[PDB]
Design a protein around this motif. Structure first.
Motif, short mmCIF file in Angstrom:
data_model
loop_
_atom_site.label_atom_id
_atom_site.label_comp_id
_atom_site.label_asym_id
_atom_site.label_seq_id
_atom_site.Cartn_x
_atom_site.Cartn_y
_atom_site.Cartn_z
N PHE A 200 0.80 -1.22 0.00
CA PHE A 200 0.00 0.00 0.00
C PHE A 200 0.84 1.28 0.00
N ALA A 201 0.67 2.10 -1.04
CA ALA A 201 1.34 3.40 -1.20
C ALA A 201 0.41 4.45 -0.61
N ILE A 202 0.83 5.09 0.48
CA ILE A 202 -0.01 6.09 1.16
C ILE A 202 0.64 7.48 1.30
N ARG A 203 -0.15 8.53 1.06
CA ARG A 203 0.32 9.90 1.19
C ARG A 203 -0.27 10.46 2.50
N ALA A 204 0.59 11.01 3.36
CA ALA A 204 0.15 11.60 4.63
C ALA A 204 -0.87 12.67 4.31
N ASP A 205 -0.60 13.41 3.23
CA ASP A 205 -1.48 14.47 2.72
C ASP A 205 -1.17 14.65 1.22
N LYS A 206 -1.95 15.48 0.53
CA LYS A 206 -1.74 15.66 -0.91
C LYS A 206 -0.39 16.21 -1.36
N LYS A 207 0.28 16.97 -0.49
CA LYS A 207 1.57 17.55 -0.87
C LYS A 207 2.79 16.70 -0.53
N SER A 208 2.57 15.45 -0.11
CA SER A 208 3.68 14.56 0.22
C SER A 208 3.75 13.39 -0.75
N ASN A 209 4.90 12.73 -0.81
CA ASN A 209 5.03 11.57 -1.68
C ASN A 209 4.51 10.38 -0.88
N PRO A 210 4.12 9.30 -1.57
CA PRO A 210 3.62 8.18 -0.77
C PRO A 210 4.67 7.32 -0.07
N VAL A 211 4.32 6.84 1.11
CA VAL A 211 5.16 5.95 1.90
C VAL A 211 4.57 4.57 1.64
N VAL A 212 5.39 3.61 1.22
CA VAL A 212 4.90 2.27 0.91
C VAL A 212 5.04 1.33 2.10
N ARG A 213 4.06 0.44 2.27
CA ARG A 213 4.09 -0.54 3.36
C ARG A 213 3.47 -1.84 2.87
N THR A 214 3.95 -2.97 3.40
CA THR A 214 3.41 -4.26 3.00
C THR A 214 2.71 -4.93 4.19
N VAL A 215 1.46 -5.36 4.00
CA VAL A 215 0.68 -6.02 5.05
C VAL A 215 0.22 -7.40 4.62
#
Ligand SMILES: Cc1cc2nc3c(=O)[nH]c(=O)nc-3n(C[C@H](O)[C@H](O)[C@H](O)COP(=O)(O)OP(=O)(O)OC[C@H]3O[C@@H](n4cnc5c(N)ncnc54)[C@H](O)[C@@H]3O)c2cc1C
Ligand SMILES: NC(=O)c1ccc[n+]([C@@H]2O[C@@H](COP(=O)([O-])OP(=O)(O)OC[C@H]3O[C@@H](n4cnc5c(N)ncnc54)[C@H](O)[C@@H]3O)[C@H](O)[C@@H]2O)c1
Length: 272
Positions: free
Chosen positions: A128-143
């Motif tokens: 899952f690629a997630i952005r803290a907010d719209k102006k940030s790049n996504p942080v990826v995590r595997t679950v």
């Protein structure tokens, strides 16, 4: 862009033609619009949604929707919508704006589409690629497990994720859905969810709760609570991510405090 998609620029509005409609029940429908050509695809990454917009009663109205169709479909996009009819609920005499506008369209009419939008994108295989907010790049995590809480129409964003997971025979992610509604007649897309439970039990767990329970009911009754979280969503851990989508009062009062009590930290809870 790799493929011939419809949504080339998120800042653009695309007027699509309504080509088909299905009455699922008194107040639920399926709306199908044509893409620019029969060979196009929508181009909506999993985890994201689109917005419809138009002018109703002199104002601009914008509303988010997660199609039930996917990028495997050529030439059309399908939306499953709940119609909020006016003069029906004592508290909301006017009804819903975008939902009634949809119900009043004639085949051949057009309406504007835009997207894709959303801070969360599922990249498959548990990633899952997630952005803290719209102006940030996504942080990826595997679950390994994805808990999912849906109330009312909040279910389509979950169904899109669930189908993406199950279509990939090599995706080992297990999805747990806790689906909440006012009454049994209000359980949107029950046939589709149950067909999926039938074919992929090992990767899809399904449970329901309703405010008013009929006499023959094998599931839960009442708002989402601590017990339901413990019994039908995966247990807390880095390997677990909880997804949510439903009415504000549901997320704020019935989900968060209880998810917190059970031990699912906010950094592992995402609200569509
Ligand atoms: C990521 C995301 C994806 C979504 N995907 C979908 C989807 O696939 N399908 C879908 O239908 N919706 C979806 N929704 C939500 C949906 O966009 C809105 O709830 C919906 O269209 C409301 O719009 P409206 O313009 O019709 O009503 P508004 O005019 O926004 O809202 C009416 C308000 O009054 C209440 N209300 C009005 N009339 C009635 C009535 N007759 N009976 C009961 N309550 C009433 C409603 O509870 C609501 O609070 C999504 C939302 C998000 C955040
Ligand atoms: N989260 C947001 O910020 C936000 C903003 C606008 C619209 N919405 C919409 O909310 C979802 C609502 O769908 P709907 O109107 O048909 O749902 P609904 O009213 O038919 O059912 C809501 C369900 O949520 C729970 N719920 C509702 N009110 C609650 C309360 N006060 N306390 C605890 N639980 C409560 C209940 O289990 C209920 O069955 C839509 O898909 C969309 O996401 C959410």
């Amino acid at each position: 862009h790799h493929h011939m998609i419809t949504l080339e620029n998120p800042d653009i509005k695309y007027p699509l033609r309504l080509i088909d409609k299905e009455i699922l029940s008194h107040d639920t429908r399926r709306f199908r619009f044509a893409l620019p050509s029969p060979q196009h695809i929508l181009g909506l990454p999993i985890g994201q949604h689109i917005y419809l917009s138009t002018r109703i009663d002199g104002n601009l109205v914008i509303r988010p929707y997660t199609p039930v169709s996917s990028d495997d479909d050529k030439g059309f996009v399908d939306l499953v919508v709940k119609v909020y009819f006016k003069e029906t609920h004592p508290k909301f005499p006017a009804g819903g704006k975008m939902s009634q506008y949809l119900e009043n369209m004639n085949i051949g009419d057009t309406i504007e589409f835009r997207g894709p939008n959303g801070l969360l994108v599922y990249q498959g295989k548990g990633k899952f690629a997630i952005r803290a907010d719209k102006k940030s790049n996504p942080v990826v995590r595997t679950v390994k497990s994805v808990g999912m809480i849906a109330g009312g129409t909040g279910i389509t964003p979950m169904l899109q994720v669930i189908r993406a997971v199950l279509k990939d025979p090599n995706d080992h992610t297990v999805c747990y859905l806790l689906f909440a509604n006012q009454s049994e007649k209000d359980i949107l897309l029950r046939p589709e969810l149950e067909e999926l439970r039938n074919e992929h039990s090992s990767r899809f767990k399904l449970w329901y709760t309703v405010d008013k329970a009929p006499d023959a009911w094998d599931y839960s009754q009442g708002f989402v609570n601590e017990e339901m979280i413990r019994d039908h969503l995966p247990p807390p851990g880095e390997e677990t991510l909880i997804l949510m989508c439903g009415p504000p009062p549901m997320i704020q009062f019935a989900c968060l405090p209880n998810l917190e009590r059970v031990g699912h930290p906010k950094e592992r809870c995402f609200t569509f």
